Design a protein around this ligand. Sequence first.
Ligand SMILES: CN(C)c1cccc2c(S(=O)(=O)N[C@@H](CC(N)=O)C(=O)O)cccc12
Ligand SMILES: CN(C)c1cccc2c(S(=O)(=O)N[C@@H](CC(N)=O)C(=O)O)cccc12
Length: 560
Amino acid sequence: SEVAHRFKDLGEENFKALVLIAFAQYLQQCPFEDHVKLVNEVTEFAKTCVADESAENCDKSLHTLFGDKLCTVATLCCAKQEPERNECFLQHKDDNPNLPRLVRPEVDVMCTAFHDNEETFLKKYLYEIARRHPYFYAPELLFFAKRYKAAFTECCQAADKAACLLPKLDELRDEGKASSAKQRLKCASLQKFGERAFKAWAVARLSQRFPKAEFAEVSKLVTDLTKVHTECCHGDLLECADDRADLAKYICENQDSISSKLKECCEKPLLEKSHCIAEVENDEMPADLPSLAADFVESKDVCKNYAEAKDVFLGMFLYEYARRHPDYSVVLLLRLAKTYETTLEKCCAAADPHECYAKVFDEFKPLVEEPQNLIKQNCELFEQLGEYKFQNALLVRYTKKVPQVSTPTLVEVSRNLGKVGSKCCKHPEAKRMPCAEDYLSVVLNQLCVLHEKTPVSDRVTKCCTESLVNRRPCFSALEVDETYVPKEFNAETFTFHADICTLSEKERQIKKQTALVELVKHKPKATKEQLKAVMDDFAAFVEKCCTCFAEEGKKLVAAS
Ligand SMILES: CN(C)c1cccc2c(S(=O)(=O)N[C@@H](CC(N)=O)C(=O)O)cccc12
Ligand SMILES: CN(C)c1cccc2c(S(=O)(=O)N[C@@H](CC(N)=O)C(=O)O)cccc12
């Protein structure tokens, strides 16, 4: 009995939480009550299987049981069976659920509702998040919940609760988005490009993290990490949590053979331990490391070793180059790896292989400099413009690259792209590239998945599917869509006045930024000067007006 199996391993508290998340991720539009009803009904069944491990259906698989339970309400896929039935659900998860934005009541209410029923208060939290982030790494969602519970347990019992709660809540809201985004990239990678692509990502990443680890150790880590993520992303949340639990147990036992930063991590509670390992900083780089050119360029057995086991061999190259380059982004390491593999592939067939692949590190020169130069440039501009203006610049730049993309998606992505400047430009040259390049992959993957829903730009499709590690370069190369035909003006498409006033400060920029997009979709060929000009005026119509809706706005459309 697979269910009984897992119920024991995870206990009841987690089992309940994990199944609530799975449901809230498969049927994101269903009310809280229904999921609650199904979790309990499901939980009871689990309890009876613990006893008689042969009580009617305790033999069935998790999918079967979860499927049948959801179909008792999903009729608000179910026509299919076991394999097809599950895949169906997976293809219908929605990255952009049009749910009502969540609004936070007065601190007073939250505290009362928390104190009264704590288990309910926390379940609805997990519920709200899971439905909005159908791919959130389940195991980490429990860490946020515990961290969420601590916020209230401490603040609701203090002088100025609000001053205590709000900040801590903000911090969580953000980090949750970051976490959700990182996770979305791992799943996309697994689902769209295959496990080979995720493994490569892992080797490079863990190699940078655990420089001291021997190649076969990392490989061991990579293989399990892959299973964990493969399972969470496919919805096998219980087995994900389990395997994720083992992996942490393992990593802590074998500490010394891995990294010397895993100390602080391995002496705390499961959840906290897991989160700690996953985010552990890189380990100090080994003292005496032979130059790479030794076994990978100069040696004359390259093609032989490549022929025998291209996988392991290339795998080794990645590990070696990565372990000593924590100043490189994972994506740059995968590009280099791809360039090396391509070189051997051709060189090895040639007459004198050695002569052909002897200058491979000169092929790397351009690949390493491109990111550095791009980053150096963009942080300069950033420091000169500030976050807001910098976001505006990217808004214009991106709308010109892919005009078809919907305004809400352009606004969301450009704003996130701007945040990369705030998060990374502060770090020193040394840590900029991992920060920047890896962050840009997460944000451009957001654009790619939101776009995969309703595709309107072949230039976006091509950059998103041609290659995973080259997405950023593909997008950066785009300039302005020359075949794009401008759009006509639509009165209501630039609509507002006073209702925008009650709106927060940020809610206002997101209003001027939305207009800016619309404007460029109208005047593609316009210039940085013009827009920057017509922009200022936009503020005016906000202060003046704040019926001027129609009046002050008429003097706006005219001048526009
Ligand atoms: C604790 N065990 C089980 C782990 C779980 C999830 C990710 C882990 C990672 S990781 O490198 O994938 N860490 C991820 C973050 C994450 N939460 O997945 C990253 O830096 O992109 C390394 C080592 C252990 C991990
Ligand atoms: C760290 N920060 C400042 C950035 C460095 C390099 C590229 C960045 C990009 S990007 O990948 O879109 N790169 C830009 C390059 C340019 N401005 O000419 C683009 O394609 O429009 C977006 C946001 C921040 C970036």
